Amino acid sequence: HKRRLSALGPGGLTRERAGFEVRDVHPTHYGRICPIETPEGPNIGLINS
DNA sequence: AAAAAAAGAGTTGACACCCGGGCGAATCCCTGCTATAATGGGAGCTGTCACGGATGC
């Protein structure tokens, strides 16, 4: 829970304003952001660690 | 074979009292008055579309 990287808050894209590109995984996350730990709820692809 | 009374009613004075209405007293709310010089304002998006409609020359 301490190694979490959220994308919301005061200055972040709202869940309704996320879209499809923000939730998608980018090929630069190799070794910097694990694309396997993410909540399977509505805010998918925004709480990656 | 007869014939009157503890209850059952019915009151009659005799307190005990319990909020109500005043008499106070103690204390709240309003309103105005202060005299050196005061002179234009701080967030907020901005990382969804798409449609469906309202103004303009």
Swiss-Prot record:
Top-rank taxon: Bacteria
Similarity field: Belongs to the RNA polymerase beta chain family.
Purpose: DNA-dependent RNA polymerase catalyzes the transcription of DNA into RNA using the four ribonucleoside triphosphates as substrates.
Oligomer and partners: The RNAP catalytic core consists of 2 alpha, 1 beta, 1 beta' and 1 omega subunit. When a sigma factor is associated with the core the holoenzyme is formed, which can initiate transcription.
Protein name: DNA-directed RNA polymerase subunit beta
Originating species: Caulobacter vibrioides (strain NA1000 / CB15N)
Organism taxonomic ancestry: Bacteria, Pseudomonadati, Pseudomonadota, Alphaproteobacteria, Caulobacterales
Entire protein: shown range: 534 to 582 of 1356
